[PDB]
Amino acid sequence: MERTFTPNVMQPTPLLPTTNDGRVTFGEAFNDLKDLARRYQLYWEGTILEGNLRAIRRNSALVQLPLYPHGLRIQPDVNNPIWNIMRDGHIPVISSGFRYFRGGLRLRIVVEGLNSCVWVQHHPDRPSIFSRPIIGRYIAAKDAYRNHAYAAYVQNMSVNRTIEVEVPFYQPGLYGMLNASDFTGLGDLLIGIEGEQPIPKEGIEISVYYSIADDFSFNIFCGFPPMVYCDET
Amino acid sequence: GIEISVYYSIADDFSFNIFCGFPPMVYCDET
Amino acid sequence: DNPPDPTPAKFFVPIPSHSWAHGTNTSEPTNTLRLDGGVVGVGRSDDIGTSDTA
Amino acid sequence: MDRPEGSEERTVQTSNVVLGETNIESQDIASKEYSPTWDRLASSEVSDEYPMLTDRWLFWKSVKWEVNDSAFGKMLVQEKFPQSWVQMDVNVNNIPRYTNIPNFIPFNIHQYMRADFEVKIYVNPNDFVSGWLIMAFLYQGSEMFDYKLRRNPAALMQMPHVLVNVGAANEATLKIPYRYVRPFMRCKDILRTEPLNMGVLFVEVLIPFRTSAASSAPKSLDVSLFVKMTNAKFTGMVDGSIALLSKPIALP
Amino acid sequence: MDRPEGSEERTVQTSNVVLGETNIESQDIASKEYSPTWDRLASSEVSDEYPMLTDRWLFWKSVKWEVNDSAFGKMLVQEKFPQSWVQMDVNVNNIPRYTNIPNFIPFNIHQYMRADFEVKIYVNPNDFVSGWLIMAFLYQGSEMFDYKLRRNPAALMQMPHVLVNVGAANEATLKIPYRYVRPFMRCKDILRTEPLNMGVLFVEVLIPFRTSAASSAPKSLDVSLFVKMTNAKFTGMVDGSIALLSKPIALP
Amino acid sequence: ISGIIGVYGLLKPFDWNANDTGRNVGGHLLWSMPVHPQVDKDQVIQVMTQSKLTQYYLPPISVVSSLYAYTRGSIKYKFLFGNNPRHNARLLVAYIPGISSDNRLTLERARNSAHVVFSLNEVSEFVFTVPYITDTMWWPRKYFVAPSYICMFILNPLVAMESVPSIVTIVPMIAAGDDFEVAVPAQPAVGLSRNIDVIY
Amino acid sequence: ISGIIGVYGLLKPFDWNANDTGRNVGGHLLWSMPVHPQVDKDQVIQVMTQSKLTQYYLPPISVVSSLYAYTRGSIKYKFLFGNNPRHNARLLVAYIPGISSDNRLTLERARNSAHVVFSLNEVSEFVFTVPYITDTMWWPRKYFVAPSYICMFILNPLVAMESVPSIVTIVPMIAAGDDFEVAVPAQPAVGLSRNIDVIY
User: For residue G24, is it left (φ>0), alpha (ψ between -120 and 50) or beta?
Assistant: First the structure.
């Protein structure tokens, strides 16, 4: 096989004795990228103001966020300097090397400001038109309010501030496509308020973090794209 | 306001019993 | 099936943290910063003796 | 050459084609080979197999590359595949047609297909020219959000590829198991996706082609490509004229 | 009719076609059925068989016959066969083409073929019309030195035939084992004989069609023909465009 | 689910006029529609109101399929002919995979796909279990395009006499096959008609 | 991990000019670089843009090693020569532990460390599995100094004729050895190039 082929090997010394992937000196074995990809990382972080929401703005969406196992497309503005100096996370970088996937994501949505009953809902097949989220008044007529019978979840920001949910993989096809260009992905995730708590005069600060589920798998290893060093920022 | 909202479901012992037809429906995408 | 679970709700007394005094002969619930999850410790050998603090 | 005829050539016969090869090949497999199982879940009609037609090897292109134009990573071949190979036969208007070539005759009467491919590349230089080519394949490469950064041969060295050394003048065989987002591909433009677009096949110029300064030496060299299908299964019999083909879109 | 739906219909399924028939057929075989053995002596290439394609039944024509024009022995169908059935699909210039119909797709890429045929004829009158049809087949009839004296239905009563009584409204099936002067037939006009000319299929009007004098009664009736191949073997793979088809010659 | 969706619902009926010399010929296509569990809005019986919503009568397979996001498997089409022993005809009912509309559809082409030839000679009902041929395992809901298409051509035209009615009415009906299955619960495509008022 | 990092990535190619009388001599060092999994920024193929970030093509070992904080084990360097049966040379490829740059590096010194002498006489590829010699068990990432250094000297200069091209291009390629291992997940040293805009 041409990728791993090694002709005429000239090796001066023996090979180095093994630590069982670090289990000898540390306690754990770092043998796999799928375990590194299950440590949570930031996904999208935004603010939402009154007045760029709906007119009536009782139980409505605040964000429809597209679920991609690679990241959303990043733009490194001056508001969140994360996306600027840290570039992408470890998950978009691991993901850019594989072609397909099959499996779900885990999310952690931390929506505060607001401190009322907030809700989340997964539309497994309404994909996949764009690489940004859509805020408030710009989400389309039929993604505006909650729907009936889509898998959803509800939480009082008074009891607890963090919603942690796991999105299933519901698709007709064999794979979902990593590195899509722009029914390929995991569909949409809608986040929204449950009935018109008055909004603080600055912001509802939402931030989504994500990871890989347990049954998730990266599937066909082609190359990595060209990278950019973070220390050059 | 006191904003109340009730959600509901079926219990475990609940059962639908005699299947006759469905009534005429209306498509939601026509709104 | 979705049978109901009517079992009574137990009491429980909230506290902000575990014991500040205890040093021995017990477990300590904690949030470790590891990739692994589990009772894990750093490796040793003879290059590194046991603790000499007796 | 020590015998009256030069030496013993080696023969690779499939169906009614026979391909001579004098050297040791350079092989690779684009992913793990398997036996399709969930494809039975997609179609209630029996999948038809045409082993005498499709297993046969087929000559695809000849691309010419010259000394004056060999950069590092000049693309000789950049094609949507199998789309370019199957739609290779065009009429006067550059509209493809599945009717002439006997390997492609079942693409005409069916709607969906599935199959594995093997691409084989041939370069016949003399002894005194030296160069090097890389032929790699990227599963559904055209749909990738950065498809035009992956064309550097530094990126191709990572995806499954073969190498053709022009000094040695070897063969090269790239097996491509069927992998896709759905258990079948479309054969024509239906239900308004391009037909039969499973990936992108590249041929780049890893080390530029060099010859001697003498005037009569060859300043050019040919590259030929043969392709064959393997587990080809067709489903969804329709009329040949019920759907149409439009001239293909090219890659940037 | 005694049930809520009229009665139990009977079903004859081959490949992905299913033909309903409510009555007792009328069958005959044009000669003794056999297994071909000397055909292996004619060609060193493997004969390809396409059972999913060719075994399938195919609708061929609808011919209309009227009360005002039914002589004794008026010919509804007089065709070189299988030539007319296989070349049934014509373009604007009346030049046939083997590309559209999935039964005929292998005639496009091969030179020679061999196969047995079964022609089945359907007439759906109401109860109160009465007539009678004869459909007979003459092996290589067109090449016969008196072919135009044998068209009288008195001559057809002797060659293998079926009868369709319009008062009863039955089906009819005529099996035709392959027999010819050579173990294969040509598929196109090559080596300058017409392609695929094995005989002549007739449909005559044995007893003229009669209806009642009432004004609203049907003065016409349709006849439909279905054909299928059986042991079809193709040999001699070539290009689809390497030979041409010219518009067919008609019989007197 | 399999017991609810096994029941036939009824679709818009339609006529042959055997005395019609134009539309009663070899090849004229009577009826056709894309094949998917939610029947197309124009072949359902509708009751329209001014300024209100239109009420559709959907077969039981079409209500169930509106409750789920994907669906697959065969469909049964039971055609029911109003006629008596004196009518006669033949029909070719073909199933074309991968076609949206009838633009390029004629009889001479339709005979190249899976089809059934039926003769209504003292037969009043027949079921045509259409295959399921699709590049994917589950096909998404429609209310999109449908995966396939179905169509019905006159093969031998309809006959009848001076003693018998000249119109034959056909009633199409649709139920799920034995292998039919639904997939992921979604926003129901249909609401109830109990209150049809709507605010645009 | 071992399967991803087993694949070779490609580094900047470079030339012998056999007709060059200056640089084609006994002892002249062709190519060299510090040995660590993240290849040095100047021997990678770069694509530079005005006001944007520079895009590096990193081998698969160099992407994986950017995801972790420490790393250890042998590296494979497969050198790939564009030549034909008529060229000939010998090279000495030495591995110097504990050196940063080539300041004090000559051929007469490099022959005192682990090295391999290779003769390109009808041989087009060879792999040099460099040892791993370091006072510590894990070596930290670089993007620091590298633990060792590697270098390649002409031993017997390149020959060729009037009938054969005078330039021989060399393509260096790098993959992880059999014992290679990574350590502690860290801030990835590299981001994706999907969006290369940067705010200074």
Answer: beta
Q: Is D73 on the interface with A (CB under 8 A)?
A: no
Contacts of G11 (CB under 8 A, 6+ apart): G39, G43, G44, G45, G59, G171, G172, G173, G174
CB contact under 8 A, G164 and D131: no
CA angle F175, F181, F185 (to 5 degrees): 110
Chain center to CA of A36? 15
Distance of CA G120 to the CA centre of its chain: 18
Characterize F149-187 residue by residue with b for buried, 16 or more Cβ atoms within 10 angstroms of its Cβ, and e for exposed.
bbbbbbbbbbbbbeebebebebbbbbbbbeebebbbebb
Does C4 touch chain B if contact means CB atoms closer than 8 Å? yes
Query: What does this entry list as its resolution, in Å?
Result: 3.4
Q: Are D139 and D237 in contact (CB under 8 A)?
A: no
Its domain, for residue F51, covers 1-200
Q: Residue D224 in contact with residue D125, Cβ under 8 Å?
A: no
Contact present, E and A (at least 3 Cβ pairs less than 8 Å): no
**Which residues in chain B touch residue C6, judged by CB atoms under 8 angstroms apart?**
none
Interface test with G, best of A16, A24, A88, A233 (most G CBs within 10 A): A16
- Could you give the count of Cα atoms lying within 13 Å of C41 in the half-sphere of its Cβ? 3
Indicate the DSSP class of residue B29. Answer: G
Asked if D155 and D210 count as a contact pair (C-beta separation under 8 A), the reply is no
Gap between the Cα atoms of E179 and D31, Å rounded: 52
Say yes or no for a CB contact (<8 Å) between E102 and D52: no
Pairing state between β G75-82 and G190-192: unpaired
How buried is F86 (Cβ within 10 angstroms: 0-12 exposed, 13-18 middle, 19+ buried)? Answer: middle
Sort F82 into a burial class: Cβ within 10 Å, 0-12 / 13-18 / 19+.
middle
- Residue F31 in contact with residue F150, Cβ under 8 Å? no
Taking CB atoms and an 8 Å limit, are D26 and A2 in contact across chains?
Answer: yes
CATH topology of domain E1-252: Jelly Rolls (2.60.120)
B–F contact: 3+ Cβ pairs < 8 A: yes
Side chain identity at residue A204, one-letter code:
I
CB pairs under 8 A between D and G: 75
Find the DSSP H helices in E126-224: 153-156
Contact with chain A for residue G14, Cβ under 8 A: no
CB of D137 within 8 A of CB of D202?
A: yes
Tokens encoding A125 = 């097949």
Show Cβ contacts of residue D9 under 8 Å, excluding neighbours closer than 6 positions. D20, D21, D22
How far is residue A46's CA from residue E94's CA, in Å, rounded to a whole number?
Answer: 68
Tell me which method was used to determine the 3D structure: cryo-EM
Spatial separation of the C-alpha atoms in residues F126 and G142, rounded to whole Å: 76
D139 and A222 Cβ atoms separated by less than 8 Å: yes
Asked whether the beta carbons of E17 and E57 are under 8 A apart, the reply is yes
Six token digits for residue G58: 């990193």
Write the residues followed by a gap in chain E (C–N more than 2.5 A).
192
Q: Which two tokens stand for residue F165?
A: 């009615």
Q: Which two tokens stand for residue G97?
A: 């532990």
Domain count for chain G, please give it: 1
| Min distance D143 CA to chain A CA atoms (Å) | 6
- Chains in contact with G, counting 3 or more C-beta pairs less than 8 Å apart as contact: A, D
Contacts of G42 (CB under 8 A, 6+ apart): none
Beta strands in chain B (DSSP E): 25-27
* b/e code D121-154 from CB counts within 10 Å (16+ = b): bbbebeebbbbbbbbbbbbbbbbbbbbebbbbbb
Distance from C-alpha of E15 to C-alpha of D83, rounded to nearest angstrom: 30
Nearest neighbour of G165 by CB, restricted to D149, D154, D210: D210
